[PDB]
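---------- Forwarded message ----------

FYI, see the Mtr2 record below. Original note from H. follows.
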Amino acid sequence: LSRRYAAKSFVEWYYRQINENKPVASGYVNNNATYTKAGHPPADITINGRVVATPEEWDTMLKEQRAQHNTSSSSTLPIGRKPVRYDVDCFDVHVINADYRFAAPQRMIEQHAPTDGVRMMMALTVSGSVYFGASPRSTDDYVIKQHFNDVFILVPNWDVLEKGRKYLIASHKYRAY
């Protein structure tokens, strides 16, 4: 399915960035000029029930999470452990609007019909686990394990689709426990 491919590609990118200690801010509408000129509001971001103003702050919170679980200065804890690792279990995607038109160049509207599976606004739900202090590939030797849920609203990246990320985050709700 076209929506599964799009979602799969985003999911793989997004959590790879986090696991490689790289910023995800470039995946949000905030940092796309085409959307910005068209007057799109900043991404709605909620982290464990708290509103976060910018994706850059979310990136900072992820750094802080690593620091919080960085026990490398310990002389007794087992060596070769990674502070934080995100594992995706599965995801679900639902097309909210198959004829999404915000900031769309007119050619893109004409070129892609609502049935072509390109101009989609998608609701993406991701389920997985967060491992703290675990070996790089272990799901058993963690010090702490969380379950997390991510809910994204994705919109088409016109810049890329007419030629980076083919879809951008317009909304993000994160919950981990």
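H. also flagged this: The radius of gyration is 18 Å.
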